[PDB]
Amino acid sequence: SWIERIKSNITPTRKASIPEGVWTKCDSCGQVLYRAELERNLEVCPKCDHHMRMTAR
Amino acid sequence: GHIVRSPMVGTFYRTPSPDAKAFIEVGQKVNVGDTLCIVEAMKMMNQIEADKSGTVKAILVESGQPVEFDEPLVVIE
Amino acid sequence: GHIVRSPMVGTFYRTPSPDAKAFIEVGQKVNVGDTLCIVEAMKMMNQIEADKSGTVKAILVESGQPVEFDEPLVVIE
């Protein structure tokens, strides 16, 4: 009876390798974002529209 | 009492570093503003903060076991 | 009370002949051994016999309407 089934835990350990330089964080809101997307949006967090640091050049 | 639940889904830890001390301890009471555990996602270790003060009744989680949203982690009385 | 039911399935009638009198009448009481209606099947008119004596309370069927097994035909009190 799959209607009454409990939820087992996910696999304790699996080797997953996401590239390290494709995710950032916004302490103002908390929504994780795509680094290249953010860099293409003039360093503006698209979710909460909170501006961040930008290189002078 | 009140039980803290992780608002995100990812790998769970207790020490912020591979060789360090856990943020909190069972027994000794904790306050409203404090970090209790780390729920890492996409290699970005985020912190978990309680909201009520009280004695640490028990810890319902173990290091290295992934958890999800609305998962009771640590109960505070 | 007790209601007679046809044990077979077929055409129902009340007069044994195309132009005749019905076996029983509403009102006036009937006895255990009596014929009350005809339930014809395969052009073989068979008779229907009650089992209890009493007053004819009402007739729940009409001539020419087929009935089946366990069909209450006439109620006898």
Add this chain to the structure above:
Amino acid sequence: MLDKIVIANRGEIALRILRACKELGIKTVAVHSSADRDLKHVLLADETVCIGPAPSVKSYLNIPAIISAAEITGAVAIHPGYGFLSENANFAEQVERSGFIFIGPKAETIRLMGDKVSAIAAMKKAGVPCVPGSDGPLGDDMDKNRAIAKRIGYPVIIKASGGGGGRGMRVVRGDAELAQSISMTRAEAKAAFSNDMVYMEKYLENPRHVEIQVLADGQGNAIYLAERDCSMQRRHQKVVEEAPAPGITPELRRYIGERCAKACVDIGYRGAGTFEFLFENGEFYFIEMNTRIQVEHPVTEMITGVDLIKEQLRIAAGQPLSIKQEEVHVRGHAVECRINAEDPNTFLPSPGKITRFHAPGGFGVRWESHIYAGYTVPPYYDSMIGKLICYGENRDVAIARMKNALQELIIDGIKTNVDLQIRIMNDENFQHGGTNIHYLEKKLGLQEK
């Protein structure tokens, strides 16, 4: 072969993908919300992950949460299905760069084809016929707009190029409201699809919705399956499909299939997609391409024997097309009638708890749904609660089987659109085959004294 994928969807399509994965031997990863913790496919999966609260924005449109779930479980690909993140090009780009495999077109083709004006321009570049029109978003000059409209011929319609889902488009009858209608359509497109681009196209009054499903592996191979026909539309959204369509002789079928295959070859398409058209006196007019597994996919599987999701899972695994042009055989006919939990007349969703459920069953009946006894319909997502097909040998047989199944089908506890389906089936013009797109609206009628 993809060792383990992620069902980046919910509901009926999620269950269908789960069944296909278990058929092909691919393991399962279930991602769900907190409200949908008793979904059929969720309960019938090895690994269940909850990635947000009840609202769609926080749970299923949370691309970071989906990628986190795909990282923790060790998957190497993700299937979006239809809806939600089906056509999100940025989602495809992130999944490609996150280290996994996107089951669908490359993000570049998603950008090129999802935007309607770019898709029409590319189709004209490839020789596929398109509706004459502006071929570009118009400005604030009413004189230019009316000149273009007179060039193409009134009436005209303004549709959001980044629009979809049966909204974000307004029909213009005359110049007395053209500018205001264009501005409000642009505002609606801003509010819905985060794009202000709106264009002008020739408006037709007697069309026949004809669409062709196609497949391509992106390696110089392009095959086309049989056609479709969704003439029974409500609010520009489909309610009763059928495939193949009446009147479309095999000559025209091959003629348009070759053009669609050439278009897929030129664009370098990958995955499962469909080229919509508009049919009238032998003329086809491309208007949009859906670069995803279309909801009315079953009415093509049953008339060809080819499982679309299996094709997508094989293509995403890199295997070349195992089916050639001559190895596709059109054998039969089909009808599909969606079931929704809305109000039959007022079209208000009616969520709640289901008390009694009973599948039709029988020869040629294929009942795609996740509803069950005691399943509480959540008031949080689309109103679809199941699809229903009745494959026959001809159209009349299919209609008869659909009528029988609808008589057999029982859903109690919430409001259902079964009555409208029965009325559509009983219609003589519908049973004849070949009604116009607005036929449903003409049968709808209007107000009364």
Add this chain to the structure above:
Amino acid sequence: MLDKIVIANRGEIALRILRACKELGIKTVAVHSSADRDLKHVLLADETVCIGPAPSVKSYLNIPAIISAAEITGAVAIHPGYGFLSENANFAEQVERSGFIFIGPKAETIRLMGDKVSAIAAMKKAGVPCVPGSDGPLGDDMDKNRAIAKRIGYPVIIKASGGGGGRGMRVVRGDAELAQSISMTRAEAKAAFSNDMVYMEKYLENPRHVEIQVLADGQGNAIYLAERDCSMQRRHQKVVEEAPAPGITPELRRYIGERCAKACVDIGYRGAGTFEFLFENGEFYFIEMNTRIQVEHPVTEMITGVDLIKEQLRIAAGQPLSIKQEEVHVRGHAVECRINAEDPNTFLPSPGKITRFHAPGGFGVRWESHIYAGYTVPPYYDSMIGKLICYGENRDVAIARMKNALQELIIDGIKTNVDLQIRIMNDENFQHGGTNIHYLEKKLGLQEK
């Protein structure tokens, strides 16, 4: 065309016939008992007639009651289906003379073929291979019996020529009990089938149950569909069928189909029938013919697209065969797993009330049953409560779909044989394809210390 027929059966086959009648536009007459007043097909019929109390002898085996119901409702034909009065030759004769049309073979062919020894003699007359044996009921001479057994080769089996239903037959290992076994088999045949005729036939140890479905209109036309394979038998009764069978190359398929068609032409057969066989190293051995719609009929419809009941209704209407030999195409594979309300291990029927029911659904799943929520299983008839098919593209796909459906399928409240079905599916030899008839019994094993 038959304007209105009678469903002279109950349950699953009754519902299937009702659906086919409503498809073809033929009206419906429902004949039922007093216990089965809430059957699905009974409730889904225009005219319902109750022709007896709970026991089968008084209600469904009451030929006068069926003919009376067919007279009052105005039908012009009757469909028996399988079981009950499927092979009652006298029933066919009475229905023919009563003024109606019997959907099935002529009573003469029923008499000639139902009796096993006469059927074997006729098959040998037509050239169809048969098991070497007595070719006639033996007497009380043990010397003659053992001489014949040595002629054909031990071991030997005694089967009731008027027998059937997996009973009325005993296997003989040696002469130490031959006479007693023959006498008790004759007594059982007397007690069951009202006939004492018992015969001797060669007994095989490693057979493969192969049977071929055929059709004929009795007018010089005889077509044969694809084969079948019921290797998984329990107590000589089928539990898991499949069609076509492994190893049977199209050369052998055509070779035996031509012979079966010639046999049907010679006998002047009418209706839907199947020629059973026994397969070993390329040799076929006819043992019996079922002159009715066989229960495992779906596994031939889905691999050919031809509806058997529609064929029977057209043939009984006098229309010639609309399908020729070259117009039958074998495309696919199938598996079927019956569902019974018996005890999984002890094989004791477990009637009662059903609490929760849920159909599998999905691509290629076809669920034939009448059970529903709250349906009370009567303790009065056969223990079958539904059939289940999963049509695939190859055997492995079909097995996978069956596993998925059985996981999805839920029947609660009464004991079901689903667990045995799962165990059979999980078996490696079964998934390989080509097991022997006793394979199931070998997997059964025996007692323990």
